[PDB]
Amino acid sequence: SAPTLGEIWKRKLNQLDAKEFMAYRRRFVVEVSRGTAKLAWIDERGGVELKGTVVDLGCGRGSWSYYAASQPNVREVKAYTLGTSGHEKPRLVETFGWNLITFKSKVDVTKMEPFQADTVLCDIGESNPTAAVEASRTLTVLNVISRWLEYNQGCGFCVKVLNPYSCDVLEALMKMQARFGGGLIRVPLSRNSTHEMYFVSGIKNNIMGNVTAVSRQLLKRME
Ligand SMILES: C[S@@+](CC[C@H](N)C(=O)[O-])C[C@H]1O[C@@H](n2cnc3c(N)ncnc32)[C@H](O)[C@@H]1O
DSSP, rough: OHHHHHHHHHHHHOOOOHHHHHHHTTOOOOOOOHHHHHHHHHHHHHHHOOOOOEEEEOOOOHHHHHHHTTTTTTTEEEEOOOOTTSOOOHHHHHHHTTTGEEOSSOOOGOOOOOOOOSSSEEEEOOOOOOHHHHHHHHHHHHHHHHHHHSSSSTTEEEESSSOOOSHHHHHHHHHHHHHHHOOEEOTTTTTTTOOOOOESSOOOOOOHHHHHHHHHHHHHOOO
């Protein structure tokens, strides 16, 4: 049922006008950066142990990196993002832990050699009206992340899954869970206009069931 229900949600979402979309997207949603709040939520729930060498793949402005850099078990943060035309570039600030981060823009992380890391973070996935476009980008991220997880036996991880209801993606996630453990969670701070979920090392759950539960929740909210 998962692809059917998420696909229904997507087609219904795309039928909303500007006013309906704006009202729908915040309905019952919890709530400085959105990025910070989401990683903080996952961290406080025990979704991911932030420790040692943290990689932040697709760091954009870098909220996750600054979050990670302020945590007691983190030793360094290596942050990477495209930062090319019309893509977010890291925003340097003077907050606690800033000196632990190395930001590198102008890097396509899908083409980077994995290296040593104790925690793998990745928040790549831009919403697109076409669910199949989102599935393809999601698959690409998961394939890249699998190489990192293979290279770093036992590392912690927290990975955005932009479209988790697509059948190919579900099978990909089950395979990652079979290989690396972990589970798939919905952050209640996510807006109703995205079906994004997070593949995390700290929580071990029923992936397909959680996805379906999120589809049914987001559909009910649109009713
Ligand atoms: C919007 S950030 C997610 C938010 C971020 N965690 C934060 O807290 O600010 C996702 C970033 O991934 C970047 N990105 C997308 N594809 C990429 C790729 N192939 N290689 C490197 N960065 C990529 C995008 O430019 C985008 O800025």
